[PDB]
Amino acid sequence: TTDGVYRVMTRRLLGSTQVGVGVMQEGVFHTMWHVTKGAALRSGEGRLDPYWGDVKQDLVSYCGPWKLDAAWDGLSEVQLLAVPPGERAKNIQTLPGIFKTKDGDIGAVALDYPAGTSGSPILDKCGRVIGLYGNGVVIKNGSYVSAITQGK
Amino acid sequence: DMYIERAGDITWEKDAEVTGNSPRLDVALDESGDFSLV
Numbered sequence A: 001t002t003d004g005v006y007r008v009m010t011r012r013l014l015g016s017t018q019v020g021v022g023v024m025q026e027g028v029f030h031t032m033w034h035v036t037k038g039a040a041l042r043s044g045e046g047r048l049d050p051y052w053g054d055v056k057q058d059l060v061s062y063c064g065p066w067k068l069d070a071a072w073d074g075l076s077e078v079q080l081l082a083v084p085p086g087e088r089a090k091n092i093q094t095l096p097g098i099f100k101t102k103d104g105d106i107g108a109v110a111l112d113y114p115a116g117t118s119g120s121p122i123l124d125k126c127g128r129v130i131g132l133y134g135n136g137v138v139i140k141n142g143s144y145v146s147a148i149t150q151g152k
Numbered sequence B: 001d002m003y004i005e006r007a008g009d010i011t012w013e014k015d016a017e018v019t020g021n022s023p024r025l026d027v028a029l030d031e032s033g034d035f036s037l038v
């Protein structure tokens, strides 16, 4: 439970499969709901039980309430700390676009990674996590745009 | 059967590749947490 970015794995029959990614911060593990479907996790500290979650936000936290409070400033470039299955963690910089909804704008990143990259953190220049990657839409040419999803 | 394993520290990288455009997209978010293009 040391601070950092973690892969979320499932053990299956022969070998493990990476289904997602999450962030440990202030003793709480943060990931996207569709990665774990809100089920318990094993860790070196023992079993992590779900504490908070919200299917509409597609988020879940373990061991405590959602701790990530930083937000995109609406202006600056951001970095996806992509942790793709079978690949080393890698930073990719981008200027977000915008998801325009009836209730307001959400920053969004036009970066396309494997499904198991879900939950990878998006950072501001201070290194604060401003959201998690992986809840998005497929646009007309088949490429992908992810919301910058932050716990409300 | 689901478990976590550390993958690194969380830091901004100065040498980072810059890519992707900045699309403006009209979307709806349903109660299931799915975005759809309008």
Ligand SMILES: C[C@H]1NC(=O)[C@H](NC(=N)N)CCCCNC(=O)[C@H](CCCCN)NC(=O)[C@H](CCCCN)NC(=O)Cc2cccc(c2)CNC1=O
Binding pocket: A034, A058, A112, A113, A114, A115, A116, A117, A118, A133, A134, A135, A136, A137, A138, A142, A143, A144, B032, B033, B034, B035, B036, B037
């Ligand atoms: C290689 C792999 N790449 C992808 O899956 C996506 N990249 C592209 N598709 N280019 C990137 C995924 C990034 C991690 N995020 C997810 O896995 C979430 C999990 C659902 C969260 C719902 N709350 N998925 C999504 O956000 C979107 C939501 C669409 C909602 C529309 N109403 N679903 C898809 O893309 C499925 C899809 C569609 C077409 C073709 C494909 C896969 C085939 N590709 C693949 O298998």
